[PDB]
Design a protein around this ligand. Structure first.
Ligand code: CA
Ligand code: CA
Ligand code: CA
Ligand code: CL
Ligand code: NA
Ligand code: NA
Ligand code: NA
Lengths: 5, 473
């Protein structure tokens, strides 16, 4: 993913 | 006489108050009359359960949007594994309703709370920018418990639209006082990640918040770096308590964890602080955090005293937030002077790194010019270098007052040969120091391998003012 939780 | 909340799970919110002093001193702020009334916080995450029995009373549609599906309703997408519970958990930390017989309470339990649904889908630069720039004259505080991968080999930050959103927010947001952006510093501790390799936490425009366990230790997931500003409690080992908040499907949880839980608690404390003085600028707020945060009894092996007498750690920044002290200092705070920026291009020629490279430079910090800085806020070492294995590098920056900031520690998983392309390593550790004098940059190979590369640019960027200092601590 490009951004993660 | 202030009456503390009667909510059924409030007694389990060990981090809000207690006789033990292992808390964020939030009840002391409540007793001064600050509960968040009139302040607006938005959770940028995977959605918010706007009808949750502990959120509905504070929910604010003006603080909300669904960027993933392009609609105003940020309701989470329900799945069998409850994948999209994360934003609802974060929102309850800020603004869960008090004294309503449900779950516990938010830090700012009378603030208005919204959510931007933006993680449930591909998170592009445009998606981030539309979330960070949402209704900036209505939302006061943005909370982000997400970021680039914590695999310990990524170097990434806001692309153009997201960075433009940061500058528009701090410049024109909140009536020109500046949007408050609160960031979770990261979960990459097991990968030996550095939160300076994350451009969101490393940004001067965000308050990057780290975590401490109940017993005052550095959690397994914690990332150390010089850009972190302060700390709030979160989870630790299985003997330590965790965070109590609203959960998906109108439930209550006592097991919210990780870096994700720290930023919302900071956002709530900042909401209380804004209620105590609505005229605080985005830079005012960082000054308050620096002055009031508490190192005591947080365990770390790197506590150091900076040039103005303040203790600072790469795990904790200036320490634990203290809500009572924040709201007290806010009330009569004098707005800081406009921010100056002094750009110092250090190198006259490229320098081979080899096993170790030390660059020394005596600066005047724009003496004689309108951007003269005698009171530092953030400092950046903007570095361009090549190297064959990036994670073998350790980088330190020493201020004229003797404060050694670790800009980059070794990252065992970072095999990249792509080096750093004008990467703006940031430190908060020299805040309020005079930056005139000798700065020292150290780059070293921490491995026995015969690594090689070249430092081609080193820009020291100083931010701050020339007035208003306190007697050092
Ligand atoms: Ca929707
Ligand atoms: Ca409640
Ligand atoms: Ca990270
Ligand atoms: Cl700038
Ligand atoms: Na402004
Ligand atoms: Na930051
Ligand atoms: Na000096």
């Amino acid at each position: 993913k490009r951004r993660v939780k | 006489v202030y009456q503390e909340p009667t909510d059924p799970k409030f007694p389990q919110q060990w981090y809000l108050s207690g006789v033990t002093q292992r808390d964020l001193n939030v009840k002391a702020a409540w007793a001064q009359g600050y509960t968040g009334h009139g302040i607006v916080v938005s959770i940028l995450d995977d959605g918010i359960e706007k009808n949750h029995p502990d959120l509905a009373g504070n929910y604010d549609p003006g603080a909300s949007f669904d960027v993933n599906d392009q609609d105003p309703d940020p309701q989470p997408r329900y799945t069998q594994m409850n994948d999209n519970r994360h934003g609802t958990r974060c929102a309850g930390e800020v603004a869960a309703v008090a004294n309503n017989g449900v779950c516990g309470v938010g830090v700012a339990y009378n603030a208005r709370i919204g959510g931007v649904r933006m993680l449930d889908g591909e998170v592009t630069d445009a998606v981030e920018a539309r979330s960070l720039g949402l209704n900036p004259n209505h939302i006061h505080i943005y909370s982000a418990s997400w970021g680039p991968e914590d695999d310990g080999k990524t170097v990434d930050g806001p692309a153009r639209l997201a960075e433009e959103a940061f500058f528009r927010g701090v410049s024109q947001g909140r009536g020109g006082l500046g949007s408050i952006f609160v960031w979770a510093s990261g979960n990459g501790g097991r990968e030996h990640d550095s939160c300076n390799c994350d451009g969101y936490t490393n940004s001067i425009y965000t308050l990057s918040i780290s975590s401490a366990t109940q017993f005052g230790n550095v959690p397994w997931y914690s990332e150390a770096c010089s850009s972190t500003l302060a700390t709030t409690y979160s989870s630790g080992n299985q003997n330590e308590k965790q965070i109590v908040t609203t959960d998906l499907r109108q439930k209550c949880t006592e097991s919210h964890t990780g870096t994700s839980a720290s930023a919302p608690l900071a956002a709530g404390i900042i909401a209380l602080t804004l209620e105590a003085n609505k005229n605080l600028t985005w830079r005012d707020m960082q000054h308050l955090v620096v002055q009031t945060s508490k190192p005591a009894h947080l365990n770390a092996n790197d506590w150091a005293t900076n040039g103005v007498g303040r203790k600072v750690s790469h795990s904790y920044g200036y320490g634990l937030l203290d809500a009572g002290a924040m709201v007290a200092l806010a009330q009569n705070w004098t707005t800081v002077a406009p921010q100056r920026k002094c750009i110092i291009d250090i190198l006259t020629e490229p320098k081979d790194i080899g096993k170790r490279l030390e660059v020394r430079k005596t600066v005047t910090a724009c003496l004689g010019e309108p951007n003269h800085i005698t009171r530092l806020e953030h400092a950046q070492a903007r570095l361009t270098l090549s190297y064959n294995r990036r994670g073998d590098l350790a980088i330190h920056l020493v201020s004229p007052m003797g404060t050694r900031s670790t800009l980059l520690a070794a990252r065992p998983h970072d095999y990249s040969a792509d080096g750093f392309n004008d990467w703006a390593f940031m430190t908060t550790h020299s805040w309020d120091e005079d930056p005139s004098g000798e700065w020292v940059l150290e780059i070293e190979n921490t491995s026995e391998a015969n690594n090689y590369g070249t430092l081609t640019k080193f820009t020291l960027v100083l931010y701050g003012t020339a007035s208003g200092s306190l007697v050092p601590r």
